[PDB]
């Protein structure tokens, strides 16, 4: 531990909020689990936003990658193969 300097200045605390709600939804089995992603996926939608086309698309970019990122690691772990797939 040294602590010298760090860069952390969001536009309005929009990213840090998504990182919390996303981790909280990763505790439920699946029913209510995915239910949380559907709320933020629609709530933070550009088409739903009144006048936030870019502001919405921005948060969406971080949310989209935040899902598959955990959805893949929180599912594919020790299962004979390694997501190779040979059936098609």
DSSP line for 25-81: TTSS-SHHHHHHHHHHHHHT-TTTSSS-HHHHHHHHHHHHHHHHHHHHHTT-SSBSB
Q: Cα-flanking dihedrals φ and ψ of residue 28, to 5°?
A: -75, 155
Q: Give the CA distances from residue 54 to residues 3, 27, 67, in Å, rounded to whole numbers and listed in that order.
A: 34, 30, 20
- Return the H-helix or E-strand segment holding 22: helix 15-24
Method: NMR
**Domains, the chain:** 13-75 (1.10.287.110)
| Range 2-16 burial, b when 16+ CB lie within 10 A, else e | eeeeeeeeeeeeeee
Q: Quick one: which of 20, 34, 40 has its CA closest to 74?
A: 34
* 11: DSSP letter: S
Tell me how far apart the alpha carbons of residues 21 and 19 are, in angstroms, rounded to a whole number: 6
* 23: DSSP letter: H
Residue 57 has which token pair? 């698309």
* 12: DSSP letter: S
């Amino acid at each position: 531990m040294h602590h010298h300097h760090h860069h952390l200045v969001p536009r309005g605390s929009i990213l840090k909020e998504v990182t919390s709600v996303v981790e909280q939804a990763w505790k439920l089995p699946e029913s209510e689990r995915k239910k949380i992603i559907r709320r933020l996926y629609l709530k933070w939608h550009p088409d739903k936003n009144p006048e936030n086309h870019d502001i919405a698309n921005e948060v969406f970019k971080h949310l989209q990658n935040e899902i598959n990122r955990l959805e893949k690691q929180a599912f594919l772990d020790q299962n004979a193969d390694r997501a190779s797939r040979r059936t098609f």
